[PDB]
């Protein structure tokens, strides 16, 4: 379903998978919240994938 994993090459970026029909906006909202709560050394970015990649 929804997955979250570190970016292979970008320590400051994570990868998020959002399956079809899922509320992307709600997923983003969470990411923006937690993205700032902690945060890496650099700027916190996420890559959003459309569809279940499992």
């Amino acid at each position: 379903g929804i997955r979250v994993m570190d970016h292979p090459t970008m320590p400051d970026t994570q990868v998020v998978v959002i399956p079809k029909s899922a509320d992307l906006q709600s997923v983003i909202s969470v990411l923006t919240a937690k993205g700032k709560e902690a945060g890496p050394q650099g700027r916190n970015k996420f890559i959003l994938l459309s569809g279940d990649t499992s």
């Binding site: 983003i28 970015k45 959003l48």
Partner: peptide
């Protein structure tokens, strides 16, 4: 992200900037 321009967007998926709370398409 596609190289060859300043506007290095993705060819697939989106980039979420959680520092400026803005989604780049």
């Amino acid at each position: 992200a596609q190289a060859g321009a300043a506007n290095r967007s993705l060819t697939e998926g989106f980039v979420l900037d959680t520092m400026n709370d803005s989604l780049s398409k």
